[PDB]
Structure formats: C-alpha cells, structure tokens
Design a protein around this ligand. Structure first.
Ligand SMILES: Nc1ncnc2c1ncn2[C@@H]1O[C@H](COP(=O)(O)OP(=O)(O)NP(=O)(O)O)[C@@H](O)[C@H]1O
Lengths: 602, 553, 181, 92
DNA sequence: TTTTTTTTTTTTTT
C-alpha cells in the first residue's frame, strides 16, 4: 500500500506538475469545482499518457484496484487546495473520459473483462435512485468495541474481529455517510450489430454526480469497466461499473436547460430572425430528401417550436403544439418525411403502431410479479412528453387508449385510475398523424370523412389536417424524377445541398439546437387585430361550411379549429423569436391551413 | 551567384526605414519548401525588427498580375520557388531603372535547369544558386561570353559555326528535364548558421522543409540526415532528464516509418492507407488484405489491436514493435520502411515525427476552408494557405489536429478512389509512357488541387509501378468537375524502389511546352509548375494525339 | 465614452501600469536616447548590472541586446519562506513585490531564458501561492462589512480582478445601513 | 461484398425516359405506379450489377432493369395495353 | 437455521 502510496504521490505529482501552457488545467479545475461542490474532476487520459505512460500501463491493467487510490490522493489534493489547516470534506468522485477507441456491444465477451471499454449504445429505462454506503461505524452486540469501516468502491461483508462471534456488528445508521447509485439499463444502438437477432441490454451503474445525468431513451456514451457479480456455474451477472459517462451530442438539454451559452448562438439565432428566408430556409432544412410538397413541408416546422401554451387561472390550459395529418396516397414521402421529423426532435419516440415498437401507445401499468405491487411501466407518449409524436398505421391504433390519444393531445394529460394509482400524468406531446387513408384515392369520390375509423371527430382533435394528392402529372415529376437519380448515386443531390450550406441552408443538427433554444424562452403572442382577423376569416370559414353544407352534406370545422389555427400563429411567430406577431405574419399561417379548408371542400 | 552573408548584409542596407521598407517576400507558392523557409526567414526579419509585407501568390501569371499591380517605392525584393526557368526581366521588363539600381530582387528555388538569364546579366538578381550549383555549368560561361558580343565570308560561316557550336551546346541546356535539387530551407539554415544562429525550432523547420519532399526522391535528402542528425548532435538539450520537462521537451531520432499517420492513427489503417504498403503488398487486393492479416499472424497482434488507437496499444507492443517488425516484415519485402529520422516532442501534447507532421500541412492546402470563379477559387486555396502558416506555429497545436484528422479524410477519399480506378483498369500502356484520365467520380473539386492529384498520382505511380517490372514509365493524370472543362492535368515520374541510380529528369516540362509551342488551343500555362496545366476536353484529346507524337522521351 | 470597464482597470491596462516600474538588466551594447522620463543614459556598459524601466528592457530583450535580471525576490528557496509564512499566518497575506503576478507572466513570456530553473517550478509555487492567498482572500470575504476594509497586502492584479464585487456590493451594504436612520 | 453504383452521366436518361414511362401511364388507367416505382428501377439494375460484379453500374445493367419494368407494367394493363405496347417501344 | 406467493394486467386467438 506504500507502493500504492508511491502511486498516490505519483498522482499528486500528476496534478501539481502538469501543464498545457501555462495553467495547470486540473488544478484550476479543482478550486473551480470545490465552490461548485462538484467534488469531482474529468481528466483526459491523453494528458495522462502525455504525463507518464507507466502509471497508465498499470492503470489500464487493474484499474479497479487503483481508481479509488487515484481518488484518495486527489481528495487529499483538495486538502492542499480548498483550505489551510493548523471540514467536513467529502470523498471525491472522479469521472474520466477519453477519445479512446469505440467497441461494439455484441462482441463484448470475456477477454476485455475487468478493463476500460468506450462504447455508446442507448439507454432504455432509468432505475430509481438507490442510495449506498460511504462511511459506516459499528458497536459490538457483545464487547461494545467501536469499529469504523470506510466503505469504498468498487460484495464485502462486515468484518468480525474485536464469542465475540460470529460477526457481532450492526450499522450505526445515525453516523454514516452516503451516495446515490443509478442502475442504468441500457441498450445497444439500433443500427449495429443486430445481425438477425434482437438488441441486447447490458446493465451498468452510476453513482454520485454521475446520477440522473442521462434521460431515459437518449443516445449516450459510457466508458466504465466490464465486470460481473452473482445476483441470484458459477454464472454471475455481467455488468459495467461507470466511469466516466459522457453524453452523445449534445445531449445536454435537460434540464431548464443549457446553452451554455457560447454567445455566437444568440447572434446566429437573431440573424436567422433577420433572414427573411429563415422560415422558408427551415422549410429547406426539413427535406434534403424530399423535393416538393412544400405545403406540408412548411407545416412540419411550426409544430416543433411549440405553439401558444397559456395557463390562465383557473386551471384551464390550452395545448401546444397541435396536430397534423399526412394521410394521402402512398408515394407521399410521409414515412420518409416522418423519419426525418423524429430525428429532428430533440427528444421524441417514433411510433408506427399499434405502438412503438413494442410500446403500449399509452403507459400500461403492470405488476412486478416479484414482490407484487403494480408499478407504472412507462409509455411511448409518456416518455415523449415535451417532444414529438410520431404515428404511422393510425388506421390501426389501439382503440381503447386511442381515446387516451383523443385526450392526451388535448388535455395534455393521461388519467390512469387503474389498479392503485390515480395520478394524471403529463403528455404535452404534439401529434403528427401519418396514417394511410382508407382505399387510397377512393375516399376522394366518396365522403372524405369517416375516413379515420368510424368518427369524423378525430379530425377536430387534430388541427393542420392535410390530404396529399399526387396525380401522375407531367414535369412536376420530370424535375423530381430528375432529382431522384441525383439523390441516389453519387449523392449528386446531396452534394448540391452542401453549397447551399455555405450559401444559405441550415445544418439541421443545428435545427435541433434552434428548436431546443427557442422553445425554452417564454411563449410568443399575437397583437389583437390578427385575432379579430381570425374572427372575420373564420366567421366565413364556418359560414362557408354551413353554406357548403346547404347540400345537406355530412362532415371538419369546430371552435377548436379556429383555436388550432391560433396556435399555428404563435408557432410561426416563435420562429421569429418575437413576443409579438404581425398581421401578415399570422396570414401565411392562415394560407397554410387554408389548404385544409379545401380538404373540407373536397 | 554570391555567398549569403554578402546579399544578406546588403539587403540590410536597404532594409530599415519608416514607413517601411521597402522590400517584401513573395511566398511561392503552395509548394511547402518555401513555408518553413519563409517562416524561419520571417523570424529572421522579425529578429532584426524589419517590416515586411507577406504575399502568398498562386498563379504563374498572377505573379505578373502582382508585380505590375502594386510596387512603388520598393527598394528591394524577395521571391521564392520561381524563375528557375523563365526570366522576369523578359516577363516584367525591366528595362534599366536608375548601376546600383533602385530596386533589388531576391529569388529562391531548387528547380533546374536555371534560366540562362539567371547567373549572368545581373539586373533583377542577385542569383541565389550559391553554393549548391557552381556548377560548372561552364556552358553558360560560353553561353554569353562566347555568344557576346558575336576572308570575311569564310570566317562568317566560321564565326556562325562556332556560334552554332555554342548554339548546339547552349541548346541542350535549357532544353532538358526539370528537377528539384535541395530544400531551400537548409540553404537558409546554413545561412542562419553562417550568421551563427541555430534554433531547435529552425532545425525542426529544416526538418519539415527537407522532409517536405521525402515522398519525392531525396536525393541529397539521403545525405541530409547527416546534414541534420549532426546538428541534432549539435543540440544537446540536456545531459539527462530533467523529466519531462513540461517545456523543452525537444526532438530526437527514432524508428520512423513510411507507413502513414502512425502516431495519431490505428496501426491497421496505418499499414492500410500507407503508400509503401500499397503496391508492394497489393492493398486494392483482398488477397493482400488477408495476406496483411498474416503479418499480424506473425506479429502476434489482434485484429482488434490493429483497430486500436496508437495511444492505447500496450507498452509491450510498443517496445517490441520494432523488433517484431525485424522478425517479420523482412518476409514480404518490407524491410525498407524503417528509418531513423526525426521526431518533435511537445511531450504532454504528444510527440510527432517530422514525416507525419508534414501531411496535415498538405491537408490545409485543398481543404479546411466566368474565369473569375476559378480565380476566386485559387484565391480560396491561397486563403487556406495561411491556416497552414499558423499550422506551422506551435502556439496553437489544436488547429493543426484539424488537418491531422483531415489526412484520414483525404486518404480515405484517395485510397478508395485509386482502387476504384484499379478494378476499372483505366490504365493505357500506350508505348512511350503509361497514361490515364478521370472523367468523373466523387469529390472532383477535391481533385482541383494540384496536390491532390500530385499525392494521388504519386500514390498511383507507386501503385501502378513498384516496379512491377519492367521499364518504369512516366505518367499523366486529368480531371474535371466545373469551369466548362479546365481538365486539371499533371506530369509525373517513376520512383525507384529505394535502390535511385539516376536523377531521371522529367521531360514533360519541355514536352508540354512543345504542345504550348504547338497549336496550343485552350492550353493554359497559368500554372506555376511546368508539370501541370489547364486543358479543354475539346482540345485535350487532340492534345493527347499531339502528346503521343512527337514523343520527346 | 469608455463604456468598459469602467471604474475598475483592465488587467490589460494594469499591466501597462506595472510596465512603468524600474528593474536591473545586463546590456549587450556599449543619440542619446533623449526620451522624456528616462534620464539615463550615456552608452551603457555591456555585461554589467544597470537600472532601467521595464518596457524598454522588454523591447531590447526582444532585440536581445540586453538581458533582464531576475528580481532577487523571485527564487524557489525564497518563495518557500514566503509561502511558509503564509501557512503559519492564516489572516495576514505576508509580503510581496506587489506587481508580481504581472511580472511573472511578463518575464516568463520572454525573459524565461535568463532565470535558472523557473520552469515547472515557480509557476507551480506561485500557482499555489496565489492559491492559499486566494483562499485567504475568499475566507476574509465573510468579514465583509460597512464600512471598514483591511486588505493589507494584496496585489493590484489580485485586487483589481475582483474589484467590482466588493466595491459594488459594499455600496449596497453601507447605503442601506446608514439609510436605516 | 459487391456494392454497385451508377454514374449520373448516362443516368439522366432514365429521368427523361421515366418521363416517357409515366406521361402516358396517364393514357390508360391508374396507377399502379408511384415515385417509389421509379425509385425501384435503380434497385433492379444494381442487382444485375451485383451479378456482373461490376462494382458499379454499366449502362446495359440498366437496360436489364428498365426492360423488366416495362412489361412488368405492360401486360399488367388491360387489353387496352394493345396501345400501351406501341408507346414503350423506344424504351426497349 | 429456515421460514413464504394467486389477481390483474395485458395478450393473441377462435
Ligand atoms: N420527394 C419525394 N417525393 C416522393 N417520393 C420520394 C421522394 N423522395 C424519395 N421518394 C421515394 O418515394 C418514397 C416516398 O415514401 P412513400 O412512397 O410515400 O411511402 P410512405 O407513404 O411515406 N410510407 P406509408 O406512411 O406507410 O404510406 C420513398 O420510398 C423514396 O424511395
């Protein structure tokens, strides 16, 4: 251990001595974080390999036996930094990341066990916070000898030495110190390497300042260490202890959230607002794939920003942002489109169901068959809260909680009174309906309504409803057909978009950060007269659709339709980053739903 | 034709005044030999506290554009990499301006043969050849002094016959293969050495300057190791560590490899994008792929460990790496990889061989950013030149690493492309010379860069011919994307397999001139480098028929 | 209208202040210069100790026709006595040349060659010195009250960099306090 | 292993000749074309390219695909296809 | 030194 103490000196050396010209980065970082009460430091393994190779060669060999030692010195480092003596100072956390070298999950077996592995995968579900020991002490049940154990990481049962026997010790719970542990359940990336099979989930565990760092269902990178423990031959459960974890780009986001700030954003986000093309250049962000369909193309944008959400007392609150329908003949690009749309969302879930992929479209509470006691299992809508709703096959959605969609879209909630739990839980999720209409183009010579299940009311529940009609028509094709062979090889259209990147167009991983950005600032609002304009526009929309109904035609319009078009205003306005909205500003939102009014006229 | 101390102490006399100066460098151009040399030179001027404008010219014609554009009270002048062939006194004209003329001009280069106007008729220059090529070169001695000033009937054809003897003598000079000789950096190093200064930087800049061309021959570069290693022995940073130290922290010799991006890239891909591995081991082949995996089957190295980052390979694999190599690589003919050359150290930031540090410099050249479009474009190249200027500067190591990864980007384009041309089999043996052409593919704009096709066809001549017996043949490549068919096209020459009997002297410098002296429709000498010209597809195919005959070589 | 800073001095500026202080150098050279605030000198003896202002020495060191002496205060074994005094005096800040942090960066930028083993040594000692001094500062900051302040020995860099926080705050203190009456 | 790629040089021809394959796909009945239907043609060619192991698409490699698509659609049309023959001729 | 457990939710199915 004095060998380990020489290693201790080696790391104290490592910190005090190291230089990037000229400040000692970790050293600054310490006194920086001690007032953060971070009590942790993120160290490049490359500044380490650059400092002394030796210590890594032995670190990479049995890091488990060293990582705590590495901390016992830097926790001492704070002692020689934080304050001078001649409290209480918590035992440090360390989080180390490195560029390293990526390894795929399916190939992880034996071998590399008990070493470092950088890798990504994606988390499925977060385990509840579980607190674990840091310090504990004990008096003897018989001789009353006072023991003090420092419980360190990374099982180990309590030592019995002062009948006395066999092991007469019970924890002094009053004086003990503690830490949280996460128990990540995380899954391999969707792309590799499923081969034919199902995606694996390998279990890992956070602690301290690592906890709650990562959302359920977001792409992430963990480094950690591959290890095993029994957990009822020898057949012990595979797992990875976690150091250090870093979000895949960004992800940051959560919570409240982040910028941070990198000032060039405000300017670059304001210049966007000074670009008259910005609304439309967002439209040109959405489909490098899809040439044309500019209408619905303008329709996607306004959703993601979030629309008006105003909470006015009493508890009455109106939703945002809205709903959209991609229903139309196959060839619409709407699934390809949607597979753009979800990748655009900062946080969302792609549902072609039924519900996705295996998800109860609404959270279905299911008993833990072990230790009984129903617990809510989460849901696609639930996890997608404050994010996009993706729906295919909406012709086929679960009929019982189809209504929970009929509800959650509107009341921004789902009430579960089932079993024990009565909690009404938030889905503020904004739906985009991509289903294929009954019989394709055959509902066009028929009543276009009742197309969606057996009721027209679903349309009212939705907002921006759009029927995409592609006739086989000339030259609108020959140009997109021309667009095609370019799109494929050699991405002759995907190069042509990179000079529009330099000339005009957005990068769209940017578009995430844009829509994340302007959704966290307070809700935009129209001046009075555009609203009264919504009044004389709609009095004629409604007038028109009673007069249209002079033929006794069954149908379509509501008073949530006018309001629907309202939210589109604050959407398109939230583009502007402006607390107000101009008359014409609102007006192209009007022309934007105006096609849906003729969808009512067809 | 003067020792450096004289011309330098003389440029001092015209050097300090305010407002400046008046003298200025012309960085010429995109070829790296100037860059280090300019920088040390820059520092020199900065050490003597002397104001100088800094001009990164590109085009050959663009030189005329600039000299004619703004030079006014300029009392003296610097130029690089140019005029080793064509005279500016003709190109600029000039004309006398006020013996002890109002303006001095300096010009540097290793390219040969020098112009006839260069050593004699001293007006603009101040010929810099010293002390490289004396030579003699007693042929220019008779090219003037026999030529100048040049019974009466019979001595007429006699004078004209002796003059025809000087004409047939001097005709052979100036008609001859154009070649590089010595990195100007070592000239300015022995210059700085004559003045007495040697900085470990300046020797490392010498390294990068000398090393700049190491893909091309040596040839003196083989004996430059002594001209450098001895200086490496002239630098004794310390008797001993003194660990690390965090600062100085200076270079030493070590096991370098022709293998590519070693330090910062996976050992696998290090063998994989590497040039020397390519032809010898057949990299476009899957045969040589598996066969390569046989090498690790003799190296005791996992395919995983080949995918490994160089930083994390076991200390064991590091210490034994070379010895392992000695036990195996000698099997497939790979014994010539290992080289004892030079490696800079920033220590904590890592260590980098010169050979390696070269490549990323060459990265910032093509990437890292109606006839006006290509001038704006060349202008963009010259723009990204400067990012490489600061990429020489250690102060920001970070910006360099950009181009470092970018090398993996470049080669990933290149290696893939060359193979893509190999299974297509685009080679035409012709008779006199092997030649190919590229009509289209991915990233042809990246092939606009003279150097991209230079590295490309370098890699591809190493590839097409190891040899690859018999009778190595000179090469030409072409490509087009935009501009209506500028068809960037370059002349190329075979590299021996490390065992160079002769200098070999590219004849296309003359030959392309014979075509520009020919019908020369659409042909553009706008390029500085005779090896390469712009050509229109319409006339390039007959440019190719006219390239067939007359075969000059 | 300066806008920035504005009351406090920019570190960028305060360096311009300290750059006006006197120091000794070792000239290479053997008109006048005339100047203004210089006085000295007649052609100044080469390879001898001589007093000049800093910035001139900075510039001629940039021509390397002079060499700057390490201040006799700046040494390893000295920093030890001072930092030790610092640990055994939890309240007082001990004693310093007062332009020092600036002097440190200034000399290390260029004058680096003249010292013997400043490298990987002093920058650490002064990082730590500035450290324990910084915690002595920050810990002294709880006594912050109106209206009295003893910062005693504190450097102009040290002080100015934190100037806005005590100044601006203390006004909010005193104002309200006497305002009570 | 083998991964085929067309070149845009001769392949605009299928944008214009698809214009030929759809302009009168109006002439009788509807559809059963889509823009996916067009997309698929290249997918048909690339396969033959994989059989030829050409590593990239030759012009003829299309002629295979195209000629397949033609009568894939043509006798799929009703007896009115008597006319639909005479139009797709140039697509031979 | 070991102790002791069938409804409720959802599902796929004639
Ligand atoms: N701009 C475009 N417009 C139309 N089709 C396109 C476009 N770009 C690509 N395509 C191709 O045509 C298809 C467009 O999707 P589409 O045929 O509408 O199926 P979908 O309707 O999106 N899926 P589904 O929701 O189940 O009906 C893709 O499979 C592409 O191959």
């Amino acid at each position: 251990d004095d060998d380990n103490t020489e290693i201790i000196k080696s790391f104290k050396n490592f910190i005090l001595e190291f230089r990037l010209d000229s400040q000692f980065i970790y050293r600054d970082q310490l006194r920086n974080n001690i007032l953060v009460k971070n009590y942790s430091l993120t160290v490049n393994m490359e500044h380490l390999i650059g400092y002394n190779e030796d210590i890594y060669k032995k670190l990479s060999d049995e890091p488990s036996d060293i990582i705590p030692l590495f901390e016992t010195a830097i926790t001492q480092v704070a002692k020689r930094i934080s304050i001078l003596s001649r409290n209480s100072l918590p035992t440090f956390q360390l989080i180390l990341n490195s560029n390293a070298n990526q390894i795929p999950l399916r190939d992880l077996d034996s071998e590399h066990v008990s070493k470092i592995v950088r890798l990504s995968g994606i988390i499925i579900s977060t385990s509840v916070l579980s607190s674990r020991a840091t310090y504990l002490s004990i008096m003897c049940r018989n001789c009353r000898h006072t023991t003090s154990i420092t419980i360190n990481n990374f099982t180990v049962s309590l030592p019995r030495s002062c009948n006395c026997g066999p092991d007469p010790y019970i924890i002094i719970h009053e004086s003990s110190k503690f830490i949280d542990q996460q128990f990540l359940k995380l899954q391999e990336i969707p792309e590799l390497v499923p081969v034919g099979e199902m995606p694996r989930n390998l279990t890992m565990t956070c602690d301290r300042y690592l906890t709650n760092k990562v959302i359920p269902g977001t792409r992430v990178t963990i480094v950690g260490i591959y290890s095993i423990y029994n957990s009822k031959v020898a057949i012990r459960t595979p797992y990875i202890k976690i150091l250090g974890i870093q979000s895949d780009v960004e992800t940051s986001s959560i919570w409240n959230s982040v910028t941070m700030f990198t000032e060039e954003e405000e300017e670059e986000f304001l210049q966007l607002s000074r670009n008259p093309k910005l609304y439309e250049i967002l439209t040109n962000s959405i489909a490098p794939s899809i040439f044309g369909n500019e209408d619905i193309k303008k329709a996607i944008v306004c959703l993601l920003m979030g629309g008006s959400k105003k909470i006015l007392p009493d508890g009455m609150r109106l939703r945002g942002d809205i709903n959209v329908l991609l229903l139309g003949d196959p060839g619409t690009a709407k699934s390809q489109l949607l597979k753009f749309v979800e990748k655009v969302s900062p946080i969302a879930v792609y549902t072609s169901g039924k519900g996705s992929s295996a998800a109860g479209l609404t959270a279905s509470v299911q008993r833990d068959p072990m230790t009984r006691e129903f617990y809510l299992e989460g849901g696609a809508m639930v996890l997608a809260d404050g994010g996009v709703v993706c729906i295919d096959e909406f012709d086929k959605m679960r009929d019982e909680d189809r209504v929970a969609i009929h509800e959650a879209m509107e009341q921004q909630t789902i009430s579960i009174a089932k079993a024990g739990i009565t909690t009404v839980l938030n889905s503020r999720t904004s739906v985009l309906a991509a289903a294929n209409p009954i019989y394709g183009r055959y509902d066009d010579l028929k009543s276009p309504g009742d197309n969606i299940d057996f009721q027209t009311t679903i349309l009212s529940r939705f907002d921006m409803i759009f029927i995409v009609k592609d006739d086989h028509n000339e030259e609108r094709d020959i140009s997109i057909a021309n667009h095609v062979i370019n799109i494929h090889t050699g991405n002759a259209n995907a190069m042509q978009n990179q000079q529009e990147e330099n000339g005009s167009e957005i990068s769209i991983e940017k578009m995430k950060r844009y829509i994340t950005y302007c959704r966290l600032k307070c809700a935009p609002r129209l001046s009075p007269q555009a609203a009264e304009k919504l009044s004389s526009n709609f009095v004629t929309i409604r007038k028109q659709l009673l007069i249209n109904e002079l033929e006794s035609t069954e149908r379509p319009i509501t008073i949530r339709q006018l309001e629907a078009i309202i939210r589109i205003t604050e959407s398109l306005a939230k583009l502007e980053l402006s607390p107000i909205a101009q008359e014409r500003h609102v007006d192209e939102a009007i022309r934007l739903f105006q096609a849906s009014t003729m969808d009512a006229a067809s | 034709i003067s020792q450096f101390s004289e011309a330098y102490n003389k440029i001092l006399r015209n050097s300090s005044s305010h407002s400046s100066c008046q003298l200025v460098i012309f960085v010429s151009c995109l070829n790296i030999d100037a860059l280090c040399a300019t920088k040390m030179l820059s520092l020199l001027f900065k050490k003597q506290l002397v104001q100088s404008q800094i001009v990164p010219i590109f085009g050959y014609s663009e030189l005329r554009r600039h000299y004619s554009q703004l030079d006014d009270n300029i009392n003296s002048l610097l130029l690089v990499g140019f005029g080793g062939v064509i005279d500016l006194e003709a190109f600029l004209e000039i004309d006398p301006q006020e013996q002890s003329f109002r303006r001095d001009i300096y010009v540097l280069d290793a390219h040969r043969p020098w112009n006839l106007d260069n050593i004699f008729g001293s007006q603009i220059i101040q010929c810099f050849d010293d002390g490289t090529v004396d030579d003699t070169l007693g042929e220019q001695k008779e090219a003037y002094y026999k030529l100048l000033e040049l019974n009466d009937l019979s001595k007429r054809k006699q004078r004209k016959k002796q003059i025809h003897e000087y004409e047939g003598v001097l005709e052979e000079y100036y008609s001859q293969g154009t070649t590089v000789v010595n990195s100007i950096s070592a000239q300015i190093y022995s210059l700085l050495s004559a003045i007495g200064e040697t900085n470990l930087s300046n020797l490392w800049l010498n390294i990068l300057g000398t090393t700049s061309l190491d893909i091309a021959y040596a040839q003196v570069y083989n004996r430059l190791y002594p001209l450098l290693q001895d200086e490496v022995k002239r630098l004794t940073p310390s008797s001993r560590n003194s660990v690390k130290t965090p600062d100085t922290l200076t270079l030493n010799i070590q096991p370098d490899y022709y293998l590519f991006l070693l330090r910062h890239s996976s050992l696998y891909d290090s063998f994989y994008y590497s040039n020397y591995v390519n032809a010898k081991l057949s990299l476009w082949n899957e045969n040589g792929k598996k066969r390569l995996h046989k090498m690790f089957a003799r190296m005791g190295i996992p395919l995983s460990t080949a995918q490994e980052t160089w930083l994390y390979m076991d200390h064991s694999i590091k210490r034994e790496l070379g010895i392992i190599f000695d036990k195996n690589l000698d099997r497939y003919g790979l014994q010539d990889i290992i080289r004892d050359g030079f490696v800079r150290t920033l220590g904590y930031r890592g260590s980098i061989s010169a050979s390696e540090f070269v490549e990323a410099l060459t990265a910032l050249l093509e990437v890292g950013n109606s006839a006006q479009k290509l001038t704006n474009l060349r202008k963009r190249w010259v723009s990204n030149f400067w990012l490489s200027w600061d990429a020489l500067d250690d102060r920001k190591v970070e910006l360099l690493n950009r181009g470092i990864q970018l090398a993996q980007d470049l080669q990933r384009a290149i290696f893939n492309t060359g193979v893509a041309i190999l299974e297509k089999k685009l080679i035409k043996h012709l008779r006199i010379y092997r030649l190919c052409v590229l009509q289209d593919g991915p990233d042809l704009d990246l092939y606009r860069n003279p150097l991209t096709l230079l590295r490309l066809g370098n890699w591809l001549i190493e590839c097409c011919a190891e040899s690859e017996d018999k009778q190595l043949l000179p090469m030409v490549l072409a490509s087009i994307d935009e501009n209506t068919d500028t068809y960037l096209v370059a002349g190329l020459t075979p590299r021996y397999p490390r065992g160079t009997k002769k200098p070999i002297l590219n004849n296309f410098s003359m030959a392309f001139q014979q075509i520009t002296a020919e019908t020369d429709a659409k042909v553009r000498i706008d390029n500085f480098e005779s090896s390469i010209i712009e050509i229109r597809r319409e006339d390039l195919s007959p440019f190719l028929e006219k390239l067939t005959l007359s075969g000059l070589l | 209208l300066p806008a920035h800073l504005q009351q406090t001095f920019s570190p960028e500026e305060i360096q311009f202040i300290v750059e006006n202080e006197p120091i000794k150098i070792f000239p290479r050279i053997t008109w006048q210069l005339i100047t203004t605030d210089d006085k000295a000198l007649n052609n100044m003896v080469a390879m001898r100790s001589t007093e000049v202002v800093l910035w001139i020495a900075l510039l001629l060191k940039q021509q390397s026709k002079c060499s700057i002496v390490a201040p006799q205060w700046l040494t390893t074994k000295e920093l030890d006595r001072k930092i030790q005094y610092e640990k055994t005096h939890p309240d007082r800040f001990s004693e310093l040349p007062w332009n020092w942090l600036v002097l440190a960066r200034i000399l290390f930028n260029k004058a680096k060659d003249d010292f013997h083993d400043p490298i990987h040594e002093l920058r650490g000692k002064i990082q730590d010195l500035r450290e324990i001094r910084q915690i002595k500062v920050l810990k002294g900051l709880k006594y912050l009250n109106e209206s009295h302040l003893q910062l005693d020995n504190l450097s102009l860099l040290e002080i100015n960099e934190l100037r806005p926080f005590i100044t601006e705050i203390m006004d909010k203190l005193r104002e309200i306090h006497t305002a009570s009456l | 292993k083998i991964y085929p790629k067309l070149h845009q040089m001769d392949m605009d021809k299928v944008s214009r000749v698809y214009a030929d394959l759809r302009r009168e796909s109006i002439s009788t009945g509807s559809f059963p074309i889509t823009v996916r239907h067009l997309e698929s043609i290249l997918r048909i060619a690339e396969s033959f390219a994989k059989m030829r192991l050409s590593e990239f698409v030759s012009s003829y490699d299309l002629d295979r695909a195209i000629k397949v698509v033609v009568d894939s659609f043509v006798d799929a049309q009703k007896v009115s296809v008597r006319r639909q023959l005479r139009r797709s001729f140039a697509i031979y």
